[PDB]
């Protein structure tokens, strides 16, 4: 619980001092992490989705939930109810472990890493990170992976504003592009 | 030629013409306007003729507001046909005008110029008219 321990002690102290929170409950926290992989290629080949599912299962350590198309789009050759993606929701200990690994190992492994974007906030204190390849994650092996694929990592924070969210992520040690 | 871009129904019941004007009985965009004192259908052609006449006299120095729009389509049977076998094809587009309705509004000119311009417009229209000003 290294990341959790920091949050409980060091991060909480920094945030409450910074924003003059009246109560400890006010202090922002990361509610959940959702990893989404969109696989439109799955329409062309079912195997592509299967390979993605395995990769996400390895990365997160939990079985992904296959996502089915809400609607049919002719341009994408998409039919409603077709499996075109996979998602995992990480909560509790699993979330902290994944996040610490991302900052500690996976983000460093990113090729030509120049820090993460500071502008990637929804305006409601929620941050989304896009990874170019899943090779960055330590578990994934280059030989095993037939096709390099990107992923969306959404970090949902209880923080009302981006600035409070930015502080929380900075305290966690998330690199920022500045 | 003013006409609706589309309508849900091309063949419609002809409008009720008895009664007095529901709305647009006051000058709201201009200094002066033309008020209808009689009831009649006003065609798109009639509106254009009246519009062209008033703009010419005004010399385009003033601004013209056309209050009435010909929403309702009306049909006519092909020539030399007997009765029945369906309603005819759309022939024109008309606005129902009842007494009190302000047909046009004019601004950016002296009253004298406006009175003449509206007079020229009035002679192009089926209804009888009276020159009117904004009231306070």
């Amino acid at each position: 619980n290294r990341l959790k321990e920091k949050f409980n002690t060091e991060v909480t102290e920094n945030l409450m001092k910074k924003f003059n929170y009246s109560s400890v409950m006010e202090v922002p926290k990361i509610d959940k992490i959702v990893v989404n992989m969109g696989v439109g290629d799955a329409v062309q080949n079912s195997k592509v989705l299967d390979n993605a599912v395995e990769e996400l299962e390895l990365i997160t350590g939990q079985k992904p939930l296959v996502t089915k198309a809400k609607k049919s789009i002719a341009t994408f050759r998409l039919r409603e109810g077709m499996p075109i993606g996979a998602k995992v929701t990480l909560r509790g200990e699993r979330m902290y472990e994944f996040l610490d690994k991302l900052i500690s190992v996976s983000l460093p492994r990113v090729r030509d890493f120049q820090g993460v974007s500071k502008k990637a906030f929804d305006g409601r204190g929620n941050y989304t990170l896009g990874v170019k390849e899943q090779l960055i994650f330590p578990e994934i092996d280059y030989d095993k992976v037939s096709k390099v694929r990107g992923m969306d990592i959404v970090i949902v924070t209880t923080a009302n504003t981006d600035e409070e969210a930015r502080e929380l992520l900075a305290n966690f040690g998330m690199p920022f592009r500045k | 030629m003013l006409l609706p871009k589309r309508v849900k129904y091309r063949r419609q019941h002809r409008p009720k013409t008895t009664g007095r004007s529901k709305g647009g009985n006051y000058v709201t965009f201009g200094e002066f306007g033309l008020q209808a004192t009689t009831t009649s259908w006003i065609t798109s052609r009639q509106i254009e003729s009246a519009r062209i006449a008033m703009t010419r006299y005004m010399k385009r120095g003033g601004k013209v507001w056309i209050k009435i729009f010909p929403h309702t389509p009306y049909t006519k049977k092909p020539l030399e046909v007997r009765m029945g076998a369906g309603k005819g094809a759309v022939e024109g587009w008309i606005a129902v005008v009842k007494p009190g309705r302000i047909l046009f509004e004019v601004a950016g000119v002296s009253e004298e110029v406006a009175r003449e311009a509206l007079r020229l417009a009035s002679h192009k229209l089926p209804v009888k008219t009276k020159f009117v000003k904004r009231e306070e």
Binding site: - | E80, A85, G86
Partner: protein, 82 residues
Amino acid sequence: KKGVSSTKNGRDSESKRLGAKRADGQFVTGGSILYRQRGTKIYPGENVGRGGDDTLFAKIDGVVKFERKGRDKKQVSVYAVA
């Protein structure tokens, strides 16, 4: 005599005699149809059943009362006479 075209209309279904079958304040025996309707313009009330076609019927002998059921809804109920 000019030749003539034809209309593509000329069709209508039989009217279904929908609406109220019994008055408010009238005694009805059980099973009496109170209202005929598509959907529920009037909801089934007290001692009133709704049929598969949404017909409202008395489930007991009593007096018919049409009542408000919220701001924009109405119901019909039957109450047994003393």
